[PDB]
Design a protein around this ligand. Structure first.
Ligand code: NA
Lengths: 210, 220
């Protein structure tokens, strides 16, 4: 019954960030705080409620007592995007809090769009993957529409979005259109139309098969 | 300093036994001030401590996993291990080994100061499948990349020019395709001038299938 609040937050670079933890009972052992950046293992930042581990930047701090604890970032930096976990050891068990995800809000930024035809090697195997790339944009929200000879596509594309960049706080997005080689060869114009709040009007990148 | 590294298979069949080993370097596992633990993290979920072992063999477990979990220590090889019996899909997770620092006179105080990089374990009846790697060919900034398609289980790692190229690299999260296999793309942006003169190669590694592929990406 540990809690952490909020579950997630979007803050501007330079903002003071304060997150809270409730232990399941009045603590006897250490209350510790861990930082887990995307794709990484958790890293100890604060131990015994308020002690910074050696090497940890002074902008991080912890405080509290009893059951109520606080973790603070005095001035949020772009590389601080992570999930932050509090941790108790009581009744002979390590227990981690639910975690608080910290991400950054920044100004709108337009995507750079690129389109890739299928490789000839893939085509030999009977499948065609057409990939559209939206690079370094903000916010995360974006609309990608595939058009094949001006026919709108449905049910044959998947999207993936990167974690927020640790330097410029932007996102990138890939959309992959997958067709059989047979279907791919039945059409000429392959286009991807990108709609995003950083653009005045939709941007289209396209190529001609062959 | 102290460094930990997990090792072991990434695929385990249902009802069978998950086995992992953590190798400790930069220090002895027989330190009286240290305990050695395992913590796991299911996809999109939080952290769950599994158990800990003291160098003399004494172990302590999460009660919800105690019946299936066994954690042992090999002081000779500077290693400690996790065995988890009768696995199901609920045991699919990234497994981290960690060092636990203890101190105190009247009370034992603990924190986890050093973590391994984590080992991805998937519980499945399916066999491993190595990916196909296809170039994403570029047509003052150009984008190029590689498509890593139809592999199982996670993860794959992608490098560019054996690690020589890191700036502007985006390796996307894998997506689960309708085929039940994973796919991902790794992309990078480079000066368009270098196209056709400089060579770009993606290095793809998929450990469960022992797949190591280097794919050159050429323009148009
Ligand atoms: Na809370």
């Amino acid at each position: 019954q540990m809690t952490q609040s909020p579950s997630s937050l979007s803050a501007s670079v330079g903002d003071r960030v304060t997150i809270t933890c409730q232990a399941s009972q009045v603590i006897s052992n250490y209350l510790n705080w861990y930082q887990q950046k995307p794709g990484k293992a958790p890293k100890l930042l604060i131990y015994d409620t308020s002690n910074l581990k050696t090497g940890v930047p002074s902008r991080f701090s912890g405080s509290g007592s009893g059951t109520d604890f606080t973790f603070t970032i005095s001035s949020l930096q772009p590389e601080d995007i992570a999930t932050y976990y509090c941790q108790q050891y009581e009744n002979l068990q390590f227990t981690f809090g639910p975690g608080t995800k910290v991400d950054i809000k920044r100004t709108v930024a337009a995507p750079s769009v690129f389109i890739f035809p299928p490789s000839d090697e893939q085509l030999k195997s009977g499948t065609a993957s057409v990939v559209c790339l939206l690079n370094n944009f903000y916010p995360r929200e974006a609309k990608v529409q595939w058009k094949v000879d001006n026919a709108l596509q449905s049910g044959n594309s998947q999207e993936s979005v990167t974690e927020q960049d640790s330097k410029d706080s932007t996102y990138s997005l890939s959309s992959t259109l997958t067709l059989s080689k047979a279907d791919y060869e039945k059409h000429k114009v392959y286009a991807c139309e990108v709609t995003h709040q950083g653009l005045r009007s939709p941007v289209t990148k396209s190529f001609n098969r062959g | 300093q102290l460094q930990l590294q997990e090792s072991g298979p990434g695929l385990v069949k249902p009802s069978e036994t998950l086995s992992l080993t953590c190798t400790v370097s930069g220090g002895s596992i027989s330190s009286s001030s240290y305990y050695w633990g395992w913590i796991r993290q299911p996809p999109g979920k939080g952290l769950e401590w599994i158990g800990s072992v003291y160098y003399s063999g004494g172990a302590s477990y999460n009660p919800s996993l105690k019946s299936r979990a066994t954690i042992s220590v090999d002081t000779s090889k500077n290693q400690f291990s996790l065995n988890l019996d009768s696995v199901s899909a609920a045991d699919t997770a990234i497994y981290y080994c960690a060092s636990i620092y203890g101190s105190g006179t009247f009370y034992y105080y603990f924190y986890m100061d050093v973590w391994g990089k984590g080992s991805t374990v998937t519980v499945s009846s399916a066999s491993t499948k190595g990916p196909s790697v296809f170039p994403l060919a570029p047509s003052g900034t150009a984008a190029l990349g590689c498509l890593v398609k139809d592999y199982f289980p996670e993860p794959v790692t992608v490098s560019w020019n054996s690690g020589a190229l890191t700036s502007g690299v985006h390796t996307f999260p894998a997506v689960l395709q309708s085929s039940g296999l994973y796919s991902l793309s790794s992309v990078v942006t480079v000066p368009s001038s270098s196209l056709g003169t400089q060579t770009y190669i993606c290095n793809v590694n998929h450990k469960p299938s022992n797949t190591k592929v280097d794919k050159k990406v050429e323009p148009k």
